[PDB]
Amino acid sequence: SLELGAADIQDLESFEAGRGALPARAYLQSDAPRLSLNGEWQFRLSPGSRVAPDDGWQLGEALNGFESLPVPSSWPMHGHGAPAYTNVQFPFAVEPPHVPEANPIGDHLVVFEAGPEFFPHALLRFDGIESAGTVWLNGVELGTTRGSRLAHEFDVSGILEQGENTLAVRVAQFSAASYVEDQDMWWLPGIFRDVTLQARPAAGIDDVFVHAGYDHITGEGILKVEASRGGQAIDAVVRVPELALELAAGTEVRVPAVEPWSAEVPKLYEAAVSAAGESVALQIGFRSIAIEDAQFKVNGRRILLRGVNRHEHHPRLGRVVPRDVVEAELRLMKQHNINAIRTSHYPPHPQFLALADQLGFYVVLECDLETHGFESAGWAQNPSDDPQWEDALVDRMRRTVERDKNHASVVMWSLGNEAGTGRNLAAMSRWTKDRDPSRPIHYEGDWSSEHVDVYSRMYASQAETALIGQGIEPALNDAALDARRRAMPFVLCQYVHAMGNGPGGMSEYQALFEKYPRLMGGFVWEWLEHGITVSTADGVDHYGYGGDFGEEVHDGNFVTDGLVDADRRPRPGLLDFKKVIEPLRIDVARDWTGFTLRNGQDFADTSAFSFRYEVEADGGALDGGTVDVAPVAPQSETVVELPGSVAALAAGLSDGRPAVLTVRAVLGADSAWADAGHEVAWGQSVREPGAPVPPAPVEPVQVQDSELTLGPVVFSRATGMPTSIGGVPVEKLGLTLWWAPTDNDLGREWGGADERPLATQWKDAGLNRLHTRLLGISANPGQDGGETLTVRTRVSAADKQYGVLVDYTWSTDGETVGLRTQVRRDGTWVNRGFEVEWARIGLEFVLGEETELVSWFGQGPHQSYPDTGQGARAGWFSLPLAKMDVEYVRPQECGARSGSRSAALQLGGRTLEICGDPFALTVRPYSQDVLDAAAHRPDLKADGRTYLYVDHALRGVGTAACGPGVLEQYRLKPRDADFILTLKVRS
Amino acid sequence: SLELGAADIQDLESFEAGRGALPARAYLQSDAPRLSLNGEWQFRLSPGSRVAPDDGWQLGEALNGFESLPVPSSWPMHGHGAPAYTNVQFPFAVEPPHVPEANPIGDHLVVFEAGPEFFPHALLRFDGIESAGTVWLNGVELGTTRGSRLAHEFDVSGILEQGENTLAVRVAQFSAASYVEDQDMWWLPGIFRDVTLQARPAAGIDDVFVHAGYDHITGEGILKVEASRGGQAIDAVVRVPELALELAAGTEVRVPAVEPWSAEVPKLYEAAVSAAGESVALQIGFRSIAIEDAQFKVNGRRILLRGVNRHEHHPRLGRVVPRDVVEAELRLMKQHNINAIRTSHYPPHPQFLALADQLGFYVVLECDLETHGFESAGWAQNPSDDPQWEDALVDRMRRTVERDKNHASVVMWSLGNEAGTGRNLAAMSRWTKDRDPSRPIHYEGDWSSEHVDVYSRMYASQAETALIGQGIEPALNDAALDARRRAMPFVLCQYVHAMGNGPGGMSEYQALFEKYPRLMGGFVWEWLEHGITVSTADGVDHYGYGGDFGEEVHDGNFVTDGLVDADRRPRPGLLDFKKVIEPLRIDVARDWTGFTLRNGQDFADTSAFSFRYEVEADGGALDGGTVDVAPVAPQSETVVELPGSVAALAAGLSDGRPAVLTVRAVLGADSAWADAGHEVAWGQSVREPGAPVPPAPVEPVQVQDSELTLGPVVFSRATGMPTSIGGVPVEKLGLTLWWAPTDNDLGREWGGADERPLATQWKDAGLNRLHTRLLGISANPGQDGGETLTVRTRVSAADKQYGVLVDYTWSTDGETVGLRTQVRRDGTWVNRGFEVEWARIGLEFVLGEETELVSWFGQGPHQSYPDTGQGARAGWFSLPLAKMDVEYVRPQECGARSGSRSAALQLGGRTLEICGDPFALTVRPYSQDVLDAAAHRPDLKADGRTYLYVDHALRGVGTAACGPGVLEQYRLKPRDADFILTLKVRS
Ligand SMILES: OC[C@H]1O[C@@H](O)[C@H](O)[C@@H](O)[C@H]1O
Ligand SMILES: OC[C@H]1O[C@@H](O)[C@H](O)[C@@H](O)[C@H]1O
Ligand SMILES: OC[C@H]1O[C@@H](O)[C@H](O)[C@@H](O)[C@H]1O
Ligand SMILES: OC[C@H]1O[C@@H](O)[C@H](O)[C@@H](O)[C@H]1O
Ligand code: NA
Ligand code: NA
Ligand code: NA
Ligand code: NA
Ligand code: NA
Ligand code: NA
Ligand code: NA
Ligand code: NA
Ligand code: NA
Ligand code: NA
């Protein structure tokens, strides 16, 4: 046997869970001496095991080819190799347990000093290594690590020396473990979490298991704190000063009156567990979880999960998320009404749990297991059902549970994600149920739900969710399993996929969640986009995605699919989600005399809120103030009278004059996660402006050689289009039926014989390449000598027989311009045997000047489409042109403001005003073809023009990239239509 | 009605065949004064009718914005606008008869002088205007033209002035006529054929209709020459000096003994038809066409059509083909055994016919009609069935027939191409049959063949052609139509689509054509690639295709689909076609004592040929000479003894020594189309070399730290691959299963539930991204202390479970290296539910040095794949590296030499020799990924390496871009395989 590297590769191809580590235990804050070894290490990268040197480097002499690297790190984020993104597909041939030849091997080394406090006994702790580590201390092999987001500890007693020590870690990117770590995220090798030296004093505490239940009938806590050393129960004293408790470890007691823990009221009691040589600090939250009557209950009450799936990602540091970023993003979640987190799809940093305990989230804590890439071969060779993987998979679940078992915020254990079905998942479940019966088990991969306590699905349609909510879903074939599952509460562990413009359809899910007790709620996919910061030539920063790093196989921008960008800037979808899940419902009376208030919280009353009202009209705020609301109990509702001045305004206002009454619930005092005045919920009553009044057509049409003039409008006799309106240059006016496809429009709509993405249906139909033919121009009798001008056109596409006849009828009294647009189908809009859907029925004005400011009356300030925009409230808004856009990583249709009644564009010295029955408003400095063609934001370029879109109809955006497409009521099928606009130019 | 251009557009949207022209007539050479107005004209381009100026330009004063342009021209070939390519799809919305707003309008003007010989009567002739012309002379509108490849004449009597005249022509690119001119070719507006002034003397001859039949029983000609003036029969004298004839026009006579016209013997008699004021010169070919017993017969004999479809294209002049290019390309056709031409899909230049008469081609003369783009809407609005188009379509057929009716070479009239079915096609057929019953009618669009005389199909499979050949195809539903069609002879008006690497499957068609009398033969699609010369930045010329000129809709390189490139350089497919259709069959005896000779001609014996033999061995030609063959009658065969020295050589040669006997039929004397010695047919008998002798494995394996040495081979212990062989640096050695897709591999294979193109099946399966894992390296006992080296690998692709185990076993005696390769499937090669086919089973050697020369024993000199290479004969060949490639416009797999037994690559100072059982040999200066990625030839770049491909198996190339894919016997399904090679390096 003559090839090199055979021994290294045999270890990497091992089915075992690594070797030499201490037993799995909790992460515990203790008074034992601790030394962080984080800092600047030395690093050397080789392309595979067979050429990785065996040159004595572990002794830190002859450091040929090492350079400085921070640890913790995801090494490709610091110029060593490159990040690589795949969703489902493995980036290596699928032949477990074998590894590819191209397998980055990273050799890490650090020299440190240990004082006498680390003797005689100490350990080394590694909180994460992707994917396989071998650890040496002073040349002595301690062992190996498997389970990339799991902790490993190694005893260094007798190996650690007083004074200088040399720690060496060889890390392989790929190993047999990669076959069970196929999460949809970047592949990023490294020592990416803390490395810590911990003294282990005699008579200490190795592990602690807190049991802190709550009896909602009596108000009592039920407390038992187990403590062990070396795997044996030990005498320790547990002290809980706030509850006046001093008790022995290992004894169960009843605490007469505790305040229970929930995400809404995350009450924690400080406790210490003390042995003669070591003391552990704990935060204890008393809460009990029960499944009863097909409901998921905490402390005796059904809860509603308002969740997100949280990955660990940083755009410049990879899997290393700095603590201040964690703290800020959790506050941002609370500020957007989120109360639940799924740790997709692996345990988080160990210090994450205390923050979730403190700030208050219901946490689904998920084991590091996903074998999704085996699905394409019908799950042949799936690790989850292969006996050779049993010890490895049970070890993952054991380490997951042991680390985090003391945290009140963890309300469910999850076995993993998209790992199919099989005997090893059943083993993991059995192990967990035996070890910790206090928490229900979650796993979506096995729909029969045989080895779980809740029924979990991902992206089940609103329709199917409604059936499950009513308990009337189709039965399993096994009647015993059906009876069990039909009696389980139901959770969407992932739903309303938040990629790009979207997600649509959130309100239809939320109405079900709030109506049906069996529906626990849902976790959006996902919290964050995994953008990675890159720069073009000339150094414009932007986010990159799959394929931007030279990957042979990748999944493009499917990793940029979140509610916030990688720097935690909200996408519009987060603003809408906040409103959809708001925990108070405020229904303002149409006569402005009061509002109905529903408290949708599970435990807290409304005493934390201040209730504010404001009345706004075109001239500004007319009135505002606070109203005193007696605290409303959870799940209750009341009517609140508004002060009489508000109704008096409603009475006085002229008919047709717009006015907006807004009632808001804000924090009355600072919380841990937001300041006093932070808005939690709102409701509105709107007095809509009257429909626009088209002008009297008293101005005649003036005929020149090549132009026509009608009041302030000049028209080309060659095209029938205006060339200027009140001095504003017009380069083009035409009908629009299409938009630059969203990420959702690039997804297939499963169901229906046509499974082309909508973007492809549009391209096949020519909707992205429409052309206009002029049929005629004629003047007609107006009023008092005036005339109207009718321009008749037909819109179609090359090689197609279907079209729409579009008639524009222009009128003017010299100041206001009336524009009537009439659209009539000419031939059936069917292509390749399927009906052609439209994006919109609208007009595109291309103006020959740049727009500085856009103002409108409608919804805002952010974008809104028919099935989104919940967070866009009624009002008057004004934005610089640049802020009308949405900085999605792949540019796509975005920025429409649906429900507009009036708009004003400032174009230098003139203002173009537009009024209509509800229309969508979009304004861009580049064309739709530039938007569509652009793959990254630097591809967008302003051309000195204004592209103004006025839509009479729009389709929704749905979630077709993953899950339901646009629901029927928001789809736009071809139809005939007519609509009126008025236009005015002020100088 | 206020829009501009309404009158111009109404004329362009007219269904009528234009106006003001003289009656259609023949193109006739006459002694009447003629003046060509070709030369430098003045030209002005406008973007559409509505802005085209009406500024008096037709009077040639105030020439604001005109510049010089040659006429004839296709104006986009001279920098005015751009060529645009579509295949089927129309480049404008389909709403006949309406035209798009973007419609290039070209205003042409020339001033010329007319002498007194053009008075009192003269006409102006236009032999082609694409697509709509309006003609003025001295400001007087003469009329308009429709039918872009048809002639129009206008009477200028009373309008032409003695002295200076001003001719003005406004030409619109698009008109209602564009809907009936949807040929797959470039859209190219212009005045693209001759413009001629012709005097019309009193007592002249306006039209002539030659009727020249042949009675094959008596050998007599049957002659009647009709002559008219002003639509009335006239007294004229017909003189045919060579036949001693002086006869009256309008009288039918029997000529006692003529020599009949055929493509093989294109006998023409010079004749003159004379009235008092004008004389016409004619070339008369006596031939009669008959359909009898389901056979297409000329002069009493069934013929075999060896055809091509000929478009008119020039890479720099567009639809203008210079006469010297026409003459040369026709000679090139004859030089490649072609005897028939279809004028796809419009009449050719009027002077083309005399050349076809003279050089000898059977011509299918096709009317300018194609409505293919209506098929996508189920032929809704198809002009061919719309009564409004009847006069326009009958006018096209009338002008087609009248122009060319006197030419012996025209043996069938065709109504058009891909125009569906309908009443107007039936009218065209009825008109033609009434006017000229001497020629059968062709039209493939109506398979029922109700209004035609032959059954025509395009790209019918070899299988279906065999059924039709035997008269056993499925019946039509109408038994009367079935009886008629089953009694028709059958022609493939298009077959073996010649796009890119290919066409495969030609031999299977040819065997049928020669076996079954009902099969008339076939016309390849097509003669030429319509490449257009363009240049990159830095000025490297290359051909462009669809999309290279900014087209919104286009069909890419589907216009580069010919046997020759646009400059008439042969593609390999033409060299193979020449051999497939060779009109003599030479079958050399295996004992080299003689050959069987079949004369496959229809009329001529073999007396025109000299029969040559040559014997070649490794050292060169051993013997050669001529053999006297008594002339063999058409459709007969004989055995010819070879001189005894040839057999004596066969006897003397050592067993296993390679030797090639070639017998060739060459022209014994110059012809009109080639020189004496031009090769027409050949046959060979080959004494194959013995299989290679692997060396005795007497050399041991030497083990170094990171390398192994086995005789002259050095191996990496990290990869198992050789790093040098006899000092030749080796960068990579690995298995190949894939090739850079051909144009055919990009086509769908209709039939079978999998209609992905093969290229897509390969991409989905990862065949374009294979990776290799090393399993082990070990030495084994050899002979006399020597050892063999076995390297075990596995080849697969990321995210796939299927692989192939590949074992390489190396041996050496210090000079020769033996390489045994064993391939074993590991898992089923099925992806997406369908079996994955392979391109090949071979090896890729990447050498670290450039190759100057490639020599081999096998077939050549050009490329050969399993279902091609008919023209590649056995022999020894040697080419510079650059000449191994094939300059297809879109680079793709090409250049393999199948059937190789030995190869030698000169790499500077060393020669690498390879021997094997038959293998395919390819050598390139760039990798397969560069080849695949390249869209035009300048994308290819040499990287300083040599890419050497040795294939044990290859698949065929088929014709899947249009018509049959690879036939079953040439497909390469996954299998297990083993093969031996020997390698030697000479310095
Ligand atoms: O973004 C697509 C998503 O699809 C789900 O099936 C998966 O569980 C998620 O991890 C993510 O990949
Ligand atoms: O102010 C009410 C709060 O209720 C919590 O349960 C939630 O996590 C917060 O996001 C906020 O909605
Ligand atoms: O190259 C594809 C070919 O397809 C045929 O159907 C057509 O008759 C030809 O003109 C050419 O378009
Ligand atoms: O030399 C025989 C010749 O026969 C003709 O019919 C044919 O057009 C030529 O290409 C050549 O084959
Ligand atoms: Na619920
Ligand atoms: Na994703
Ligand atoms: Na209050
Ligand atoms: Na809204
Ligand atoms: Na885009
Ligand atoms: Na035949
Ligand atoms: Na073509
Ligand atoms: Na002879
Ligand atoms: Na051959
Ligand atoms: Na290519």
Author numbering:
A (entry chain A), B (entry chain A): 24 to 1010
Q: What did the article's authors report about this structure?
A:
The question of the effect of point mutation of the other catalytic residue, E517, has not been answered before. As expected of the mutation of the catalytic residue, E517 into glutamine caused loss of function of the enzyme. The ArthβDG_E517Q exhibited no catalytic activity, whereas activity of mutant ArthβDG_D207A was severely depleted. Mutation of catalytic residue E517 into glutamine resulted in the elevation of the melting temperature of the mutant in respect to ArthβDG by 3.5–5 °C, depending on the investigated buffer solution.
32cB is an interesting candidate for industrial use, as it can hydrolyze lactose at rate comparable to mesophilic βDG from Kluyveromyces lactis. Furthermore, it exhibits additional transglycosylation activity, it catalyzes synthesis of GOS and HOS, for example: lactulose and alkyl glycosides. The functional dimer of ArthβDG has two independent active sites. Each of them is located on the top of TIM-barrel Domain 3 and is constituted of residues from both subunits of the dimer.
